[PDB]
Design an enzyme around this catalytic site. Structure first.
Site, PDB file in Angstrom:
ATOM      1  N   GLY A  23       0.817  -1.192   0.000  1.00 28.07           N
ATOM      2  CA  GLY A  23       0.000   0.000   0.000  1.00 28.07           C
ATOM      3  C   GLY A  23       0.846   1.236   0.000  1.00 28.07           C
ATOM      4  O   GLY A  23       2.049   1.182   0.321  1.00 28.07           O
ATOM      5  N   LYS A  29       5.069   4.316   1.921  1.00 24.32           N
ATOM      6  CA  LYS A  29       4.470   3.080   1.493  1.00 24.32           C
ATOM      7  C   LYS A  29       4.746   1.926   2.439  1.00 24.32           C
ATOM      8  O   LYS A  29       5.589   2.040   3.333  1.00 24.32           O
ATOM      9  CB  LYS A  29       4.898   2.706   0.089  1.00 24.32           C
ATOM     10  CG  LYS A  29       6.360   2.527  -0.123  1.00 24.32           C
ATOM     11  CD  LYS A  29       6.636   1.903  -1.482  1.00 24.32           C
ATOM     12  CE  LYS A  29       6.440   2.870  -2.605  1.00 24.32           C
ATOM     13  NZ  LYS A  29       6.857   2.258  -3.896  1.00 24.32           N
ATOM     14  N   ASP A 143      -7.826   8.098  13.318  1.00 26.72           N
ATOM     15  CA  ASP A 143      -7.790   7.824  11.894  1.00 26.72           C
ATOM     16  C   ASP A 143      -8.271   6.420  11.559  1.00 26.72           C
ATOM     17  O   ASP A 143      -7.662   5.722  10.754  1.00 26.72           O
ATOM     18  CB  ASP A 143      -6.376   8.025  11.351  1.00 26.72           C
ATOM     19  CG  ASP A 143      -6.342   8.220   9.813  1.00 26.72           C
ATOM     20  OD1 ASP A 143      -7.384   8.554   9.161  1.00 26.72           O
ATOM     21  OD2 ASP A 143      -5.227   8.045   9.274  1.00 26.72           O
TER      22      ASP A 143
HETATM   23  O1  LIG Z   1       0.522   2.125   9.433  1.00 27.41           O
HETATM   24  C1  LIG Z   1       0.843   0.998  10.016  1.00 27.41           C
HETATM   25  O2  LIG Z   1       1.090   0.925  11.239  1.00 27.41           O
HETATM   26  C2  LIG Z   1       0.731  -0.243   9.189  1.00 27.41           C
HETATM   27  C3  LIG Z   1       1.272  -1.400   9.709  1.00 27.41           C
HETATM   28  C4  LIG Z   1       1.240  -2.587   9.003  1.00 27.41           C
HETATM   29  C5  LIG Z   1       0.639  -2.659   7.759  1.00 27.41           C
HETATM   30  C6  LIG Z   1       0.109  -1.498   7.200  1.00 27.41           C
HETATM   31  C7  LIG Z   1       0.156  -0.308   7.914  1.00 27.41           C
HETATM   32  O3  LIG Z   1      -0.212   0.899   7.384  1.00 27.41           O
HETATM   33  C8  LIG Z   1      -1.541   1.183   7.002  1.00 27.41           C
HETATM   34  C9  LIG Z   1      -2.176   0.119   6.248  1.00 27.41           C
HETATM   35  O4  LIG Z   1      -1.829   0.094   4.893  1.00 27.41           O
HETATM   36  C10 LIG Z   1      -2.527  -0.968   4.220  1.00 27.41           C
HETATM   37  C11 LIG Z   1      -1.655  -1.620   3.204  1.00 27.41           C
HETATM   38  N1  LIG Z   1      -1.773  -3.075   3.153  1.00 27.41           N
HETATM   39  C12 LIG Z   1      -1.190  -3.951   4.011  1.00 27.41           C
HETATM   40  C13 LIG Z   1      -1.294  -5.335   3.851  1.00 27.41           C
HETATM   41  C14 LIG Z   1      -0.708  -6.194   4.729  1.00 27.41           C
HETATM   42  N2  LIG Z   1      -0.050  -5.639   5.790  1.00 27.41           N
HETATM   43  N3  LIG Z   1       0.501  -6.269   6.849  1.00 27.41           N
HETATM   44  C15 LIG Z   1       0.817  -5.241   7.692  1.00 27.41           C
HETATM   45  C16 LIG Z   1       0.519  -3.948   7.160  1.00 27.41           C
HETATM   46  C17 LIG Z   1      -0.030  -4.214   5.931  1.00 27.41           C
HETATM   47  N4  LIG Z   1      -0.566  -3.378   5.039  1.00 27.41           N
END
Ligand SMILES: O=C(O)c1ccc2cc1OCCOCCNc1ccn3ncc-2c3n1
Length: 337
Positions: A23, A29, A143
């Site tokens: 993402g 990212k 958020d």
């Molecule tokens: O901001 C954090 O603390 C954050 C921590 C871990 C992950 C993502 C995060 O950020 C926001 C989410 O973004 C979505 C993107 N997709 C995925 C898919 C699978 N994973 N596994 C962990 C994360 C992840 N993100």
């Protein structure tokens, strides 16, 4: 220079090999990596833009996660586990456990179809439990949104469905975790005037009346509606229009909130300053409608969900249901033995 350090095959910190992007955001990212020092297991690494506002948020996130993962080492309350952090070419990187798709991406990839009600019930319970834990530790997330709620596993089965003449994905396990603590704020810290991603932003926030834990409850209400319908009910990029949409769906704002706000530009003689016969006005009328008219069934379980959502979308934060109360709501009775 972020594009230059986040490519497939790059190695971070002599250890993590980037596989792909999970993402992207204004913050930077999240990439999936192979951790070569933990036997090849896959992890998620958040690579933060080298821009002050995002560096500070990342530093703040790291403090919040140290606290949460120490208080709840087994993730009983379903906050993501931070494994470590480091710098790579002047960018803060935070390593997390690898989860499945965000609830947003799952919906998106399924052609913007909603979740089934029994899944929504379990996901909602887990979200409420997880965020209530934050609320019990003097924190407000600020958020919450479907992008920040992730499935532990996003595997699904896929069949042709006659009823809708299309292939459809059915989620196997609906367990979730809450992520993204870069905006989370302690009761005694400075409360930024603007918080939340717009579509999930509470009316006290838009009106700059001050905010606290209840703003999370509002966000959760918006999330549950999206899970039920497959789309947001506040699709707008403008605050006034947003308030007009609220008014159509939930009725008029309370007088006392209108009188108290420092955002005079939205109002005229204590009513929203919104021509309902304008271009945008007619759109808001024809697209939005009272909350309960969104229900896809009159079955009592649907009614119970909508009663909860309605209480979460109470305008006055002082009156809005708390997550402690929400966890006892009848909608969740089916989860209890
Ligand atoms: O901001 C954090 O603390 C954050 C921590 C871990 C992950 C993502 C995060 O950020 C926001 C989410 O973004 C979505 C993107 N997709 C995925 C898919 C699978 N994973 N596994 C962990 C994360 C992840 N993100």
């Amino acid at each position: 220079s972020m594009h230059l350090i986040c490519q497939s095959g790059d190695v971070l910190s002599a250890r993590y090999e980037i596989v792909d992007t999970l993402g992207e955001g204004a913050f930077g990212k999240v990439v999936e990596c192979i951790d070569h020092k933990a036997g090849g297991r896959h992890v998620a690494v958040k690579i933060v833009k080298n821009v002050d506002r995002y560096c500070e948020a990342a530093r703040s996130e790291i403090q919040v996660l140290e606290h949460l993962n120490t208080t709840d080492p087994n993730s009983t309350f379903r906050c993501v586990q931070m494994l470590e952090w480091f710098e790579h070419h002047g960018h803060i990187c935070i390593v997390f456990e690898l989860l499945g798709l965000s609830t947003y991406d799952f919906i998106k990839e399924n052609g913007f179809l909603p979740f089934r009600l029994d899944h929504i019930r379990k996901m909602a319970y887990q979200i409420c439990k997880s965020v209530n834990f934050l609320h019990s530790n003097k924190l407000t997330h600020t958020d919450l949104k479907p992008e920040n709620i992730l499935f532990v596993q996003s595997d699904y089965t896929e069949a042709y469905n006659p009823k809708i003449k299309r292939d459809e994905r059915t989620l196997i396990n609906p367990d979730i975790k809450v992520v993204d603590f870069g905006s989370a704020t302690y009761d005694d810290e400075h409360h930024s005037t603007l918080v939340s991603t717009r579509h999930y932003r509470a009316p006290e926030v838009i009106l700059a009346l001050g905010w606290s834990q209840p703003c999370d409850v509002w966000s959760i209400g918006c999330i549950l509606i999206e899970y039920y319908l497959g789309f947001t009910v506040f699709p707008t990029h403008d605050s006034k229009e947003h308030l007009a949409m609220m008014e159509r769906i939930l009725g008029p704002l309370p007088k006392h909130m209108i009188q108290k706000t420092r955002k005079r530009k939205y109002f005229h003689h204590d009513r929203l300053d919104w021509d309902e016969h304008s271009s945008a006005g007619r759109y808001v009328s024809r697209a939005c409608k009272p909350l309960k008219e969104f229900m896809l069934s009159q079955d009592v379980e649907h009614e119970r969900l909508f009663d909860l959502i309605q209480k979460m979308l109470e305008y006055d934060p002082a009156k809005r249901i708390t997550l402690r109360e929400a966890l006892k709501h009848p909608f969740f009775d089916l989860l209890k033995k």
